[PDB]
Amino acid sequence: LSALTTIGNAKNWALSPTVFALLSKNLMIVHSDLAVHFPAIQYAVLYTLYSHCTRHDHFISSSLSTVTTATKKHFSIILNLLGILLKKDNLNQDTRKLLMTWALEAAVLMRKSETYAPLFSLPSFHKFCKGLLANTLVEDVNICLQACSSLHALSSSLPDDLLQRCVDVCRVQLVHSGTRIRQAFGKLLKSIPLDVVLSNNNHTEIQEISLALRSHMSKAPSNTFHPQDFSDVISFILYGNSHRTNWLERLFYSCQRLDKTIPRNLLKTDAVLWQWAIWEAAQFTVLSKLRTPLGRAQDTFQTIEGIIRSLAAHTLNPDQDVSQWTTADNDEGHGNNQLRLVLLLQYLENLEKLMYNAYEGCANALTSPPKVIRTFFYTNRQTCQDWLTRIRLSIMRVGLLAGQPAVTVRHGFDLLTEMKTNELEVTIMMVVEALCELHCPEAIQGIAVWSSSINLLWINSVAQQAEGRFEKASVEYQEHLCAMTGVDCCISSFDKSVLTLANSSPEVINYLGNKACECYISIADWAAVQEWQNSIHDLKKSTSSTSLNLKADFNYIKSLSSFESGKFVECTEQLELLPGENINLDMKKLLPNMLSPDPRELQKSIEVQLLRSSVCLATALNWQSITENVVKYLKQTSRIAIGPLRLSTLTVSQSLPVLSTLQLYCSSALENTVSNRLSTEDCLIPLFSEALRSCKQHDVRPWMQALRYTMYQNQLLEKIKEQTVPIRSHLMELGLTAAKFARKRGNVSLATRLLAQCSETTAQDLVQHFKKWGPELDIEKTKLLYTAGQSTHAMEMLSSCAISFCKSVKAEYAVAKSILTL
Amino acid sequence: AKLLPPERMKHSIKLVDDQMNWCDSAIEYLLDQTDVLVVGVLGLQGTGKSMVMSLLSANTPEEDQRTYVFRAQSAEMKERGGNQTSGIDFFITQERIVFLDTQPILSPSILDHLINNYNLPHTYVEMQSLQIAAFLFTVCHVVIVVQDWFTDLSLYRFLQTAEMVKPSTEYYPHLVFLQNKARREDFCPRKLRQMHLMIDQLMAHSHLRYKGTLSMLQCNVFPGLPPDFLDSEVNLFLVPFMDFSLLPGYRGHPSFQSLVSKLRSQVMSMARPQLSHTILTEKNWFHYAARIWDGVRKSSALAEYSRLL
Amino acid sequence: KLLFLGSDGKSYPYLFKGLEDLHLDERIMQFLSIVNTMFATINRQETPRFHARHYSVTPLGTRSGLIQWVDGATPLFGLYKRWQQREAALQAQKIVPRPSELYYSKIGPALKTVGLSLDVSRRDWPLHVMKAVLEELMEATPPNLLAKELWSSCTTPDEWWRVTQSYARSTAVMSMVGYIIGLGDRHLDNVLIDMTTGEVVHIDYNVCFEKGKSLRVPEKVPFRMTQNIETALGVTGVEGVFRLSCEQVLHIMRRGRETLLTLLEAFVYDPLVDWTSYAVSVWKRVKAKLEGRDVDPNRRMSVAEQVDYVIKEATNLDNLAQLYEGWTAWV
Ligand SMILES: O=P(O)(O)O[C@H]1[C@H](OP(=O)(O)O)[C@H](OP(=O)(O)O)[C@H](OP(=O)(O)O)[C@@H](OP(=O)(O)O)[C@H]1OP(=O)(O)O
Ligand SMILES: Nc1ncnc2c1ncn2[C@@H]1O[C@H](COP(=O)(O)OP(=O)(O)NP(=O)(O)O)[C@@H](O)[C@H]1O
Ligand SMILES: Nc1ncnc2c1ncn2[C@@H]1O[C@H](COP(=O)(O)OP(=O)(O)OP(=O)(O)O)[C@@H](O)[C@H]1O
Ligand SMILES: [Mg+2]
């Protein structure tokens, strides 16, 4: 083979079976049985073939079109061989490395010129991509990095079928014990458009992780968890001091035994390790008759109750500064605090499950505990039930603070069932709030109907907010407050006649007021927010309630309004009063101290950082003066914005947060635009019209954030002299999609505002003001008019548009849609 | 928050001095907890026992050899061909796992140093090796055997004869075979089968546990080798050197770090059977080991064996 | 029961049924497949997918056939049985009986304390006695057998919420489909639950098309809504996602009733179908159910009214009190 390599590399064709066919089809038995006992021959054959193919650029120019006639069918063969060799799960390390290098080279060359576009439609290409996807997520780190780089090289111009798998792989790899893997997969995930990341498809990797955890849980207890291990885990979860110097994998290995089944590839994920550690800790706590090293059978309960109560108390007034839970030394401290908060709830749930199974039992779900433990938990069942009932409310509050509505929903359901005989109103409000956060209007309606059998019509209004109908929800909240208080406190809005056609206790009053404020902020109506604040102040001064107050930083709202309005001086002045690091003129400590573990606070901090970076860039523009510093700020912001995604992956959520994902994408886009001065298409946010067919279950807030960060670049284009990428088309596309979603949920005011800004309080006003995306804009205007209530005017305009389109040039879908709708 | 750990040993401590005396200084680092694991190793002059213990207890291949918890050999010392570790060492990791590093057996350097200092020193060194081997086989759970070149034909005889000189339904610690500084030829199916067969024929009456544990095939070391290819996969592991026109770029074996990590994971999960018919704690185990050492020192079988030669 | 090993190294179990036509069962599956296809449009804008689990059946002639064996699902009856064993264990601290034995033991004294005996005809049985026995049996069993099982099966609260929602949606979909097609004999052994996803699966279909209304003991329940089934849906019961899902399913079926009627008509005039004017009657009954004229001379009921009426009739204590002993209504 080595001697033949001399003629294989020659570039000069008959002469017996050609080298390509000799090493491609003639020598194929070496990959079946010889590769197991003699891998040297297989490696030599693959090496000589690679050396011969790399000289002619893998015969890429021969296709899509003498020597060319014979080589016209070589690229497909190369891709097919690479793919078939990659799906094998019994390859050698050296062979796999060589194949990965070959695949990376081919992938990089396959985007070199535009002409190779048809090559992406060949079946061999799909087979090759499948092999690349199946080669990652392996024990080897270098192999995974190479596969990720190759996949990211040709991320674009790839079918969604492989994109979904890429999304799942990136999501699972976001929580790895190695920093290189996380950093490499972050870029790949960021390169995928938002129209696919926010899809409602199922993730296979997450399912595999869940299955492994379930299999381990269903097994019988091993009783190998030593007291020191429990002490260290509890110390880290309660105080943050692990007292250990990759300490999870080592512990897991030390807890196993070879004398007496989790996959080996999953041992490198921190999510599986954390869940296993929590389950083992709870198992040990239950099997130890509650006599854990933390104290006696009552000391553990007292400690948990005290910590939970302190957190619950701080939740009501986020100005308590609980020790070891609100202060951090750097940016990693806050993330660790959030992780600990989630682990605490997980541990409590596991403990409750084990106790119930110990005193009652299950069927094939969990093995029965020993008799000595069963009798102990059977005689002292009343004490455990009473303790859980007493701390249930605090647990629900903590769950709401940690952004885990499932915990509070389950606890609220259990509490409601136990109260089969005014602590009921608070429980109902908490359950309704959690349901609203989980976007489940049906559950809210059911709760309202069930509670009506015991004067709580306001619950129905909350259901509307869960569906995304903010315009109607605000009006309903105002009416409810006016009826429960007796004082007029409404705010000017759109005509209720068409608005309704298109779609007491102090705690309840405060809850409704805060709900209306958040509802107004969701649609990005700063004027409405100011009017609402004035009305609330007037109502409070006219009732002397002394217990009503909106929980929202007005400085942040004013800053956002000033930034969106185009005024930067007032924006900078407002931002200067916010907490955290001063505005750009150390990098690790960007977040302020005494920060609450609430995800909303983190989102607010990230938004403030983005605003500061944007203002600094605008001031600097009117290339390393104010560029070497803003880049670091944006990089750190992006590093902090990935925390929520990792937390979501830690648990089997099967979904990704929308606000967090959007913030991360916006930060990446801002960093790219700052480092490139709007020179490449990568500086634009990936929110196209495709999302209109795969993100119909999301609210309008995503488009609001995207538009807020896109208008900035659109208006900033006037301060750039060099050639830039076209942004008007992207902005108009975003505006049209946002208008469609806003109109589909009854938000007539927001839809009208978006349509008006894209085209550049009464039903007749819209008629008098309205009577490559031209046809789409006209169709949307007609649809909005019809939804408002003017069917005749909308039909007339649609008919006129149809006649005008029939005489156009293309009019492919315009004429069809116009006549069909008519 | 009074559940702080005892202490984190930054370096090992000599448990047995060169004069073969028991040192009572490791009790302060032990607690009153049960279910403890102990590890021991028997090797030659330059096999690399200290390096293995360092890499498996509290060290990584990236760390410098000067910061190893176990004093390893130095290049400037290999010229004289002398030993580096004397007596027995002690060190406990953060996972409550006890490690023990011993001196080389039948080391010519020890004999040479003893010359310039009851019948002949050869018998003295022989009995010393037998005593250390018996103590390890008596108070250890798993014993790893390190080797440089295969087919020694002498280590097996020593291990077999060491089991008949122990002080006291008997306890037999597991024996793990490790091949250090393995070459590319050793990572071949034919060579692997030959090694397995040779070990099986050489340890027919070992009477110790050396099969069904630490399977290298189950560790995905050989992805294509089927489990039925080997008649009886014994507990054998390979460790290559630290990190060609016919085969350019072909290594022939996995990375050194990967194999080291795999061995560490397999050893950390070894079984911990009861040494005696009573539950022993860290302090209890230390006391038992001290008593066993005192008893084996002034024994009778060892004296008879030494007198016979 | 046999097994087939495919090329992908995946085992597939099958049940070889004999002494049965199996031709109508194949038609039922095709109908279910079309119904599932009708939910593909909405399934793209809602997390809990609208699906109707079903298997594949292939007749191997005229009296034999093969049926796909669904794995990963377990019958609900098993859970109940396990509970009994656990209770028995308690009796040992300080052989479980068959449902028929328990029912007879509880109905004996009740009938003897009023005047009748065990030799009287089943039709001449007082309603109060049956209601009292049913109430006693209901109060003697706990309704947390299914809720606690699904709760303990999950790993994290998010998984628990997802599984609960999926189970409620699947139960509502199957309830509406079964009521429209006229499924019967919905005993505990004929219902399976998937702890991994929460979906419900049905097995027997030989007592379909209102065939259960004419037996030794007629049944007046559109579907199964026992204590354990209703308790696993949540604290509200059947007033939450269950009712809305049922209304949506009925709306989709009513909108596209033309395709269902055409398929049924084609099924009626099929030589390879053993219906024993019976087929015409079945077709008319299904047509009336789909059109909303189930029980009314000329008044067409709405989707909400139909759902409410079916739900009330499926949970009425009077109907559940006069059912067969095998069809355990207390659990
Ligand atoms: O506003 P569009 O972009 O034209 O959306 C339309 C239409 O919207 P409208 O409800 O406002 O008419 C409907 O959307 P959904 O009801 O699914 O939310 C749906 O048509 P239906 O009203 O009949 O359901 C579907 O139209 P179609 O069914 O023809 O696919 C859809 O998209 P297209 O009109 O572009 O196809
Ligand atoms: N597709 C299937 N998947 C899994 N289990 C099945 C399947 N089909 C049938 N079974 C099981 O097979 C069992 C035997 O059914 P069986 O009760 O004999 O039906 P049948 O005989 O046709 N009706 P009957 O004569 O009244 O008993 C059922 O109770 C189910 O538990
Ligand atoms: N896998 C390896 N690759 C390269 N060098 C190695 C390897 N293993 C050991 N060595 C080297 O060989 C020598 C082994 O001496 P070391 O002190 O580690 O233990 P030892 O041979 O058991 O000696 P002693 O019994 O005298 O303490 C050192 O110089 C070490 O650096
Ligand atoms: Mg050494």
Numbering used by the authors:
A (entry chain A): 615 to 626, 632 to 684, 698 to 877, 881 to 895, 900 to 1060, 1067 to 1099, 1103 to 1151, 1178 to 1259, ...
B (entry chain C): 169 to 285, 293 to 343, 361 to 435, 454 to 519
C (entry chain A): 2139 to 2232, 2245 to 2426, 3607 to 3661
What does the paper say about this structure?
To address this question, we reconstituted purified wild-type SMG1-8-9 with an excess of AMPPNP (instead of SMG1i) and subjected the sample to a similar single-particle cryo-EM analysis routine. We obtained maps for SMG1-8-9 and SMG1-9 at overall resolutions of 2.8 Å and 3.1 Å, respectively. In the reconstruction of the binary SMG1-9 complex in the presence of AMPPNP, we observed no ordered density at the substrate-binding site, consistent with the reconstruction obtained in the presence of SMG1i. We concluded that the autoinhibitory conformation of the PRD in the insertion domain of SMG1 is connected to the presence of a nucleotide in the ATP-binding site and is stabilized by the presence of SMG8. In the binary SMG1-9 complex, the portion of SMG9 that interacts with the N-terminal HEAT repeat helices of SMG1 changes conformation, exploiting part of a binding site that was occupied by a short N-terminal segment of SMG8 in the ternary complex. Indeed, two hydrophobic residues of SMG9 (Leu456 and Leu457) take the place normally reserved for two hydrophobic residues of SMG8 (Leu351 and Leu352). Hence, the conformation of the SMG9 segment observed in the SMG1-9 complex is incompatible with the binding of SMG8 to this part of SMG1.
The PI3K-related kinase (PIKK) SMG1 monitors the progression of metazoan nonsense-mediated mRNA decay (NMD) by phosphorylating the RNA helicase UPF1. SMG1 is a member of the phosphatidylinositol-3-kinase-related kinase (PIKK) family, which also includes the ATM, ATR, DNA-PKc, and mTOR kinases. Despite the confounding name reflecting a possible evolutionary origin with a lipid kinase, and in retrospect the ability of some PIKK family members to bind inositol-6-phosphate, all active PIKKs are Ser-Thr protein kinases. These large, multidomain enzymes share an overall similar architecture: a C-terminal catalytic module (comprising the so-called FAT, kinase, and FATC domains) and an N-terminal α-solenoid (that typically serves as a protein-protein interaction module). SMG8 and SMG9 form an unusual G-domain heterodimer.
